């Protein structure tokens, strides 16, 4: 079929981010509003209800490299979180442990990644994990 080139796909995601989607429990935008490369993004996830993540806002950094969206983006939590697939010391998201990233398709997007991480927060193996104090962030 017809592939939309990286920069134009990212402009589409930019506009969708600004319009917002669904109930607004995930959101994304450019980290630097003068970054013409559209590389570094800020992600936000509202922790889901009836989990240990509830009523907490999670900030993330999402990096869309030169081969995005053929290649998956790199993701890390800024806000500290105890969650399977997330390195507990650095916040880095292990792609092999998150199915959307391990089985990446070029139809996916920053939105899809954030929605998946939020869905996974509701999983039996995550929803009961004791969390660090609210507000803490990793370094680097």
């Amino acid at each position: 079929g017809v592939k939309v080139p990286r920069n134009f796909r990212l402009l589409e995601e930019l506009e969708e981010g600004q319009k917002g989607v669904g109930d607004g429990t995930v959101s994304w935008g450019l980290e630097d509003d003068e970054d013409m490369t559209l590389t570094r993004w800020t992600g936000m996830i509202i922790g889901p209800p009836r989990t240990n993540y509830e009523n907490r806002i999670y900030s993330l950094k999402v990096e869309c490299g030169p081969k995005y969206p053929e290649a998956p983006p790199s993701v890390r939590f800024v806000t500290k979180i105890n969650m399977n697939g997330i390195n507990n010391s650095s916040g880095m998201v292990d792609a092999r442990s998150i199915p959307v990233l391990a089985k990446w398709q070029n139809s996916y997007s920053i939105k899809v990644v954030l929605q998946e991480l939020r869905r996974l927060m509701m999983s039996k193996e995550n929803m009961k994990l004791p969390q660090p104090p609210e507000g803490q962030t990793y370094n680097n």
């Binding site: 939309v4 970054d35 013409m36």
Partner: protein
């Protein structure tokens, strides 16, 4: 089994009869994706500079407008911080009768004669202090468009 004739024609015409001051090269992977360089027009504050632009022909081309954006930072009332271009024919006034060549020289004409009146800080600066806006445009040309 490939591209519509029009695209083949327009692609081949861009490489055979190039618009003066404008270079266009095909992407090495995407036959609807083009890398453009526009020379700053003579007697403009962008003169002497070269500006990277990218062009994409969407599936619905020519029913749908081509997608165009600056990749070189530029101080201009019709170009934003991410390089997006506000030009009638790229959205509202686009018709299939227009072609890629028309878009490129129109963008070039925009550089030759900025339109501050267009419904941002840049455009507003160009209205109230045009002299300073022009020297700022020249400054950014020196900083971002000379290599």
């Amino acid at each position: 089994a490939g591209l519509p004739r029009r695209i083949i024609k327009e692609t081949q015409r861009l490489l055979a009869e190039p618009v003066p001051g404008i270079k266009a090269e095909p992407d090495e992977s995407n036959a609807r994706y083009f890398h453009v360089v526009i020379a700053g027009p003579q007697d403009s504050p962008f003169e002497g500079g070269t500006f990277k632009l990218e062009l994409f022909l969407p599936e619905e081309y020519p029913m749908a407008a081509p997608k165009v954006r600056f990749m070189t930072k530029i101080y201009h009332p019709n170009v934003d911080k991410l390089g997006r271009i506000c030009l009638d024919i790229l959205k509202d006034k686009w018709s299939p009768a227009l072609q890629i060549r028309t878009v490129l020289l129109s963008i070039q004409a925009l550089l030759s004669a900025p339109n501050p009146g267009d419904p941002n800080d840049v455009a507003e600066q160009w209205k109230t202090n045009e002299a300073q806006a022009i020297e700022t445009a020249r400054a950014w040309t020196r900083l971002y468009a000379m290599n």
